[PDB]
Amino acid sequence: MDTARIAVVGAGVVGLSTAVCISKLVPRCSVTIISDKFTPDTTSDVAAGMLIPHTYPDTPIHTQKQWFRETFNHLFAIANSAEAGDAGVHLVSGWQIFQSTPTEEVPFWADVVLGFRKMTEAELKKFPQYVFGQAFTTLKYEGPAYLPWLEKRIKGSGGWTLTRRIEDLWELHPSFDIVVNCSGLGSRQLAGDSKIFPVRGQVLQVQAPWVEHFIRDGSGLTYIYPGTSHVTLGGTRQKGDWNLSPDAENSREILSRCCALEPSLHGACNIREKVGLRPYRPGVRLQTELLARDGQRLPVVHHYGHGSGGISVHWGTALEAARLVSECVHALRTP
Ligand SMILES: Cc1cc2nc3c(=O)[nH]c(=O)nc-3n(C[C@H](O)[C@H](O)[C@H](O)COP(=O)(O)OP(=O)(O)OC[C@H]3O[C@@H](n4cnc5c(N)ncnc54)[C@H](O)[C@@H]3O)c2cc1C
Numbered sequence: 001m002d003t004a005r006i007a008v009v010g011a012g013v014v015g016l017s018t019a020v021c022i023s024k025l026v027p028r029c030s031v032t033i034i035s036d037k038f039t040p041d042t043t044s045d046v047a048a049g050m051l052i053p054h055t056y057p058d059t060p061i062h063t064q065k066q067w068f069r070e071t072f073n074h075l076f077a078i079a080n081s082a083e084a085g086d087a088g089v090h091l092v093s094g095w096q097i098f099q100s101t102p103t104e105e106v107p108f109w110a111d112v113v114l115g116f117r118k119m120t121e122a123e124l125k126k127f128p129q130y131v132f133g134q135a136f137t138t139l140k141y142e143g144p145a146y147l148p149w150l151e152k153r154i155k156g157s158g159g160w161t162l163t164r165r166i167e168d169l170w171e172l173h174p175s176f177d178i179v180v181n182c183s184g185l186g187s188r189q190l191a192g193d194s195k196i197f198p199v200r201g202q203v204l205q206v207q208a209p210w211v212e213h214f215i216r217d218g219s220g221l222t223y224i225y226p227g228t229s230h231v232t233l234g235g236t237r238q239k240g241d242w243n244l245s246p247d248a249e250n251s252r253e254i255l256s257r258c259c260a261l262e263p264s265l266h267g268a269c270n271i272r273e274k275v276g277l278r279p280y281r282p283g284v285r286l287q288t289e290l291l292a293r294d295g296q297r298l299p300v301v302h303h304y305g306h307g308s309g310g311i312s313v314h315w316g317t318a319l320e321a322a323r324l325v326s327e328c329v330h331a332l333r334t335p
Contacts (some may be wrong), residue, residue, distance in 0.1 A: 003028050004026060004028050004029055004030060004075065004332070005030045005176050006019075006031035006032070006176070006177065007032050007172050007176040007177075007179045008031055008033050008034070008179075008182055009033075009166055009169075009179065009180070009182060010180075010183045010184060010186075010303075010304075011035035011039060011042055011161070011173075012043060012044040012182065012184050012319060013042075013044035013141075013143065013147060013150075013310075013311055014044075014184075014303065014317060015183070015184075016147060016150040016154060017150065017282045017314045018044070018153060018182050018317075018318045018322065019033060019154050019159060019180070020150060020157075020318065020323050021315075021318040021321070021322035022154060022180070022322045022325050023154065023158075025026065025304070025322040025323075026322070026326050026329050027329075029114050029158075030068055030073070030158070031138060031154075031159050031176060031180075032160055032169065032176075033154065033159055033161050034161075035161075035183070035241030036163065036186075037152075037288075038163065039144070039148050039150075039151055040144070041186060041275060042143070042147065043185065043276050043278075044147060046143070046275070046276040047143055048084065048140075048223065048225045048234060048314050049143060049146075049211075049225070049232070050138060050140050050214060050216075050225050050312075051071070051075065051113075051138045051139045051140065051141070051311070051312040052216065052309070052312060053068040053107075053109045053306045054312070054313045055308065055309070056282070056284065057282040057283070057285050058282065061108050065108050065109060065315035066111070067315075067316025067317060068313050068316065069107055070315050070316040070319060071312060071313055072112055072113070072138075072312075072318055074140065075089045075315075076088075079279065080276075082164055083149070086145070086149050087145065087149040088138060088141060088144075088145030088228065089140075089141050089142075089146060090139065090143030091114075091139055091202060092138060092139065092213075092225070092226060093136075093202045093212075093213050094135075094136075094226075095119060095123070095133050095135045095136075095214075096135075096136070096216045096218060097119075097132070097215065097216070097217050097218065097261075098217070098218045099125055099129075099131065099217070099218070100131055100132070100233055101131055101132040111159075113137070114137040114138070115135075115137055117136065117321050118132075121283075122313065123135065125129075127261065129257055129260075130217075138214075140214075140225065140226075140227070142228055142229070145228075145307075157239070166183075166190070169188075169191075170295075171182070172298075173296065173298045177299070177329075178320065178328055178329065179298070179299070180300075180325065181300055181301065181302040181303055181304060182219075182304060182321075183304060184279040185198055185279035185304075187209075187279075191300075191302060193285065194280050195282065195285075195305065195307075196279055196285070196304065197244050197307065198239075198241065198277035198278065198279065198280065198282060199237055199238065199239050199240075199277070199278040200236065200237075200238035200240075200242070200243065200252065200275065200276075200278075201234065201238075201276050201308075202233030202234065202246055202251065202275045203232055203233065203254075204234060204258075204272070205231070205233075205269045205270075205271075206231050206269070206271045206273050206275045207229075207230055207231060207268065207269050208264075208265060208267075208269075209231075210264060211231050211262060212226050214226060215262060219235075220281045220308070221235040221237070222235040222254075222261060223257035224261060224262055230270075230272075233255070233258045235253075235257055235258070236253075239280070241277075242277065245275075246263050246273040246274065246275050250273075251273045255271070256324060278308050279306060280307045280308070281304070281305020281307060282305070283304050283305070284305050284306055284307070284310065284313075284317060285302045285303065285304050285305045286302065286303055286304075286320050286324070287301070288301045288302075288327070289301070289302055295333075298333075301321055301324045301328065303321040309324075
């Protein structure tokens with residue numbers, strides 16, 4: 001037929017990024033986006049948005065580092081472009097502190113992020129309960145702004161957004177050629193894999209524009225991130241908690257920790273708490289599965305289980321997923 005009919009389930013940041021890379025990799029494409037919840041309210045919108053490579057347990061550290069590099073150098077061109085307002089990608093400076101001096105003070109992502117260095121004595125004076133610190137400048141992406149921009153790009157490519165429920169993948173078989181699974185935590189029901197589980201995270205969005213440097217205490221328990229609209233203050237990592245009701249004691253402990261780290265936070269307004277379910281998987285599922293039970297073929301390339309560090313690597317993972325897509329499309333062309 002000389003045309004390929006693609007499909008991407010998932011409206012998260014990676015669900016759209018994958019279709020972007022597919023539209024710019026595969027020669028002949030007709031990729032569509034099909035998800036229950038789109039860019040107004042996805043788990044990628046509630047996300048803080050800082051580009052800090054959280055260490056994946058089950059992925060090669062050089063592969064993960066390269067993913068962060070490929071993502072960073074794309075967002076870095078975005079921040080220097082004219083569309084940085086609409087795409088919502090801005091350079092954010094700040095510091096990563098530590099309770100005790102680590103054995104090695106250089107991570108695997110020092111030479112990619114801008115100007116990795118140590119905190120001076122005068123900089124260590126800003127935090128009395130802390131011995132060692134690091135200083136650097138990264139990029140933060142606003143989800144309620146970045147994801148709509150990706151939508152406006154894929155619309156130019158030729159895709160469209162359908163809002164329907166997909167209980168099982170076989171609904172796409174009698175029409176679509178290949179399916180791209182980017183449903184995130186939802187894929188637990190889609191692909192049946194039980195490895196992915198939800199890590200609950202609650203963040204208080206407070207408004208205080210004087211804060212302009214981010215502050216992360218190394219532990220995931222305390223992060224203070226500046227935002228273009230709401231300063232994002234959070235440190236909750238409950239595991240297996242599907243509960244999306246904002247619990248109050250978390251809003252107490254997060255505020256106490258973050259207020260201790262940055263004191264000027266005392267005079268702040270509009271302390272509105274939201275929650276989210278990180279789709280956690282030891283290794284981000286990125287492989288081509290060919291499921292077909294007493295029927296015709298159905299190639300499905302999986303792409304989920306991003307965890308707490310999926311945004312900082314969403315472009316590299318998109319590249320690898322589009323690689324599998326191109327390989328399988330070639331397998332369909334040639335016999
Ligand atoms: C509070 C919080 C803070 C975070 N902070 C950071 C951070 O600073 N840095 C970082 O790198 N990462 C961070 N993350 C992680 C990051 O937000 C996610 O891991 C990642 O964006 C999710 O990738 P995804 O697009 O596959 O999943 P999602 O964003 O959840 O996208 C999945 C989408 O697929 C669709 N879908 C789902 N199920 C179905 C179904 N059954 N049928 C049809 N469509 C379906 C829906 O539209 C859904 O929104 C954070 C996460 C949370 C919760």
